[PDB]
């Protein structure tokens, strides 16, 4: 308690934060579509997909330990 | 002390990381009042507006509780 | 051990959000280029570059405690 509950919303706080990041990818992925880009960026969602993965696991994590 | 500290500089690296989330915002949303967008969009707003002030709200939390 | 480890992922996750967020100001930079903009923009490259020092700094903070 106290301390472990310090870290629960700082983990909620990060897990906000990711929806927050996830719509801001998409208000810009829009903003790339409208502009005319069939391509030639499809190697920077390759980035922001796998450091979303990297990420939705490491919360993952944290959800597991914070039982224990 | 130590452990406590430790999670001293984890809300400020996110209470920071808040400030570039909405500096980003704010920078996707020029970039769509430019282009022309009299609505179509207001519903996305709702959605960071809603998150931002969970997550503010969540910071506060913290900020009381690292009183004790 | 437990509670530091909690800690563990705690700022991996950060850290990881920090590079979705580089890739998020530089898709919003060639958004803003494309357009057209020789300037009148250079004072918020400006709040996002000391929020990322800032934001890297803190980072640093958290790895050396995390050594003891």
Known sequence: SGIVQ???NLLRAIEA???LLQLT???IKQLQARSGGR???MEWD???NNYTSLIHSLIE???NQ???
Chains 1, 2, 3 share one sequence.
């Open 6 to 8: 310090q870290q629960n």
């Open 17 to 19: 934060q990711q929806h």
């Open 25 to 27: 990818v998409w208000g």
């Open 39 to 41: 391509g030639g960026w």
């Open 46 to 48: 390759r980035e922001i």
């Open 61 to 63: 994590e944290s959800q």
């Open 66 to 68: 914070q039982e224990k």
